């Protein structure tokens, strides 16, 4: 409870004393065209990589949350025995 209030006392010390460069420019003339011109001129490369991010976040989360009904008792081979869908470094107490 003191580390969060220490962060909040730190940031409010910053926010109030920092001189912000407020620009008195009339803003946003229908800012849906000024937000989609940025998806293809300025931030084009974040926009294409965010597509690869959503594919990978769909590959992994389908993998991590599916129920393995293809072959559940399948320890496919063995040099020394490894359980299915578990890493070969077996837990051991020294």
């Amino acid at each position: 409870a003191v580390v969060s209030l220490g962060v909040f006392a730190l940031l409010t010390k910053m926010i109030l004393q920092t001189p912000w460069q407020l620009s008195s420019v009339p803003p946003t003339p229908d800012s849906i065209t000024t937000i989609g011109q940025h998806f293809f001129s300025d931030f084009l490369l974040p926009f294409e990589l965010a597509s690869v991010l959503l594919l990978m976040a769909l590959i992994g989360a389908v993998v991590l949350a599916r129920r393995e009904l293809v072959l559940e008792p399948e320890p496919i081979l063995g040099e020394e025995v490894v359980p299915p869908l578990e890493l070969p470094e077996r837990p051991r107490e020294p």
């Binding site: 580390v3 220490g6 962060v7 730190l10």
Partner: protein, 53 residues
């Protein structure tokens, strides 16, 4: 066993305080990643007061 043991006392000091520091700093890692989020956020709180002072 006179002049060796004042430098093998250093072996009993330095070769032992290195291992028991590593067995002492081992318990900084304790699991419970909420504690890991303290030490990350105490470092954020600690490095600003390190740099404005």
């Amino acid at each position: 066993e006179v002049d060796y043991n004042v430098v093998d006392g250093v072996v009993n000091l330095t070769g032992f305080v290195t291992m028991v520091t590593g067995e002492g700093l081992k318990y900084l890692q304790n699991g419970r990643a909420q504690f890991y989020a303290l030490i990350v956020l105490l470092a954020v709180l600690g490095f600003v007061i390190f740099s404005v002072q």
